[PDB]
Amino acid sequence: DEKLLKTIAESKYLVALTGAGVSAESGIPTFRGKDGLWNRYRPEELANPQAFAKDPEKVWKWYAWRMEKVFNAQPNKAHQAFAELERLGVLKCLITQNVDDLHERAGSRNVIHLHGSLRVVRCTSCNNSFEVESAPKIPPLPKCDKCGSLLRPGVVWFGEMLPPDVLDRAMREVERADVIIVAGTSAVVQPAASLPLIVKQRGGAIIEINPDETPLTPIADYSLRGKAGEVMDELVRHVRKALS
């Protein structure tokens, strides 16, 4: 506790990296198993450009379902805790692999979305892009109102480059950080998984919060097991008191 609490409380520029594990307690599967709708594919076999070219209706049906579930979900104790850490001025920037909007919904202000967002729909051809309040019904295939081309979810698919400006911004944030909380990520997906290494390489501390050991665990200064929500809730309660 005390050394961990002190590390967070006394941090000069704390950042965070979150993954699917912080949203499971809102009812959103981690998508480390199967696709969650048919349960016939690995999620990576649908979230890619090859699948979308083969059968855009199938891929859109999956995303429409994903969108509805997220839009109907509520933020949980982990999302609330991260928002509270920003509110208290400890957390400077929240980097997330998640395509849900539950961090924002909990009141997080400075969020970087490495893999885009289910709230965003964009054109496959022109530069048209917009946000949705609710999920489209599939079929029909959603078409761009500006040019008539096929629309797609505003997420980064496996095999696609992260938007250079987004990844660059995340890199600059971890280049400033003396402490990083890495919560609910399996530390497998690149280049996202390389971000905490930058903090360590520059002499900072890594606090891993995850129910299981990961490839990051060997270099994590602290690695906390248990349920993401419960651990983050307890952690922010202690940090708030420590700074009070």
């Binding site: 893999h115 095999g159 696609e160 480059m161 690149q190 280049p191 998984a193």
Partner: peptide, 8 residues
């Protein structure tokens, strides 16, 4: 690190 979104 960079490169395309991928599993390690």
């Amino acid at each position: 690190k960079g490169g395309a979104k991928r599993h390690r």
